[PDB]
Symmetry: C2
Subunit: 158 residues, 2 copies
């Protein structure tokens, strides 16, 4: 029903004009896929869906060195909750080369995360509610994505 | 439920591994928005959703010179049906500059077309059925989009 486009530069957040809720979709598009970049500190790149109060509803962290993708949630002044890990970063991106897209489906009780065309995990939510903002963090030298990542939300779907 | 990514170069078509049906979404992403390009011949750019038999379920033609976007449908060896026109090409793209995305929502009886963040038209279908393939046509010199346009489909939504 509705589409919104956001240009997110590395290390910045953006507020959504249309929050994402159950039944909605969000896709992060990177024109690059630097899977052979230097080590993160410790994260090479992070993608995040935030609640109205700034809590990390979904934190996606890519670490080339540890060679794993971490998924977690946490309140603004709170600790990371239960960590979910998916091993082999490059493997999750296989299929589409040179660029990448991370799509998150809000399924109410879980977040379905698809890297390129592969569903990497069905994340059981640890914090619920609507997604009010987004962020993409990484340094200028070791991000696995382009300096700018386009985020596109599809809302009013349910 | 499912995501598929296709790289479509100007003047080519691609077959979908997952056809698009009622409730599904397709987005064409262009890293450029050449709204000041030379005249089309007559189309500067066209985006198409095709049926299993190759019929044009939805034909989107951008003509800078005529300064209008045309929407129509037709069978492979048939004539264009009822033409729907939207005047002022640049106006439909306003809001997002430098790049562009055309999203099509298959609503069963109609196709909702969103250019960037603006719903440009609720197209009453003249030919029904599932979308089996996609295409992006334009010359190498006057397309309003980049040489390569990424198409992303979101299927299994209904």
């Amino acid at each position: 029903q509705g589409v919104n486009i956001y240009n997110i530069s590395a290390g910045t957040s953006v507020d959504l004009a249309a929050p994402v809720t159950t039944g909605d979709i969000v896709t992060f598009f990177s024109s690059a896929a630097n899977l052979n970049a230097g080590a993160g500190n410790p994260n090479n790149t992070t993608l995040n869906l935030f609640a109205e109060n700034g809590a990390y509803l979904l934190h996606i962290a890519f670490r080339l060195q540890e060679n794993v993708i971490i998924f977690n949630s946490r309140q603004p002044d709170g600790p990371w909750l239960v960590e979910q890990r998916v091993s082999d970063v490059a493997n999750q991106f296989a299929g589409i080369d040179g660029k990448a897209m991370v799509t998150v489906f809000d399924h109410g009780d879980k977040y379905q995360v698809v890297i390129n065309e592969k569903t990497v995990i069905q994340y059981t939510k640890q914090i619920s509610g609507l997604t009010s903002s987004l962020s993409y963090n990484a340094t200028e030298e070791t991000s696995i994505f382009s300096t700018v990542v386009e985020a596109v939300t599809y809302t009013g779907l349910a």
